[PDB]
């Protein structure tokens, strides 16, 4: 059987930009994508700690070192600047491999400072 497993997550990042008129996606500092193994154009779930909303979109890269988390397009109705969110991606694989699978998790505090 094939399992769906957490690939990676960015835990408790803060939204830095949110505009309806910008591209419909979530733009993320490439350093953050690197740490969590999340890819350009990959499906992601965003879970909003501040307002409780949960939604799925896809990731794109923002400039390395910018510490940007930009929720744009329709998704701007689901998060505001300052909101604390968790961004996750999932992969599938057979059960035998899933049993020892290790996700890529990065934790954040303050102004999107990775700890």
Between CA 88 and CA 71 the distance in angstroms is 14
Asked if residue 19 binds a copy of itself (CB under 8 A), the reply is no
By the rule CB under 8 A, 78 interacts with a copy of itself: yes
Q: Is 58 in the site for a copy of itself (CB under 8 A)?
A: yes
Is 57 annotated in a binding site? The answer is yes
Is 23 a binder of a copy of itself (CB under 8 A)?
yes
Burial degree of 26 (CB within 10 A; 0-12, 13-18, 19+): buried
The residues with which 10 forms a beta bridge, in sequence order, are 87, 106
Q: Quick check: is 25 catalytic? A: yes
66 with 33: CB under 8 angstroms?
no
In the list 77, 80, 109, 113, the residue contacting a copy of itself (rule: CB under 8 A) is 77
Would you say 92 is a known binding-site residue?
no
Give the DSSP H/E element, type plus range, for residue 5. Answer: strand 2-14
Q: Give me the residues that bind a copy of itself (CB under 8 A), please.
A: 1-7, 9, 11-12, 20, 23-24, 39, 41-43, 45, 47-49, 51-52, 54-58, 73-75, 77-78, 85-86, 88-99, 101-103, 107
């Amino acid at each position: 059987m094939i399992r769906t497993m957490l690939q990676g997550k960015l835990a408790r990042v803060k939204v830095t930009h949110a505009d309806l008129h910008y591209e419909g996606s979530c733009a993320i500092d490439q350093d953050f994508l690197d740490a969590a193994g999340i890819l350009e154009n990959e499906a992601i779930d965003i879970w909003n700690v501040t307002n409780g909303k949960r939604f799925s979109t896809y990731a794109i890269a923002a400039e390395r070192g910018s510490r940007i988390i930009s929720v744009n397009g329709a998704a701007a109705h689901c998060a505001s600047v300052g909101d604390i969110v968790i961004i996750a991606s999932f992969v599938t694989m057979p059960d035998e491999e899933a049993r020892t699978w290790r996700p890529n998790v990065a934790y954040f505090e303050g102004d999107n400072e990775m700890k």
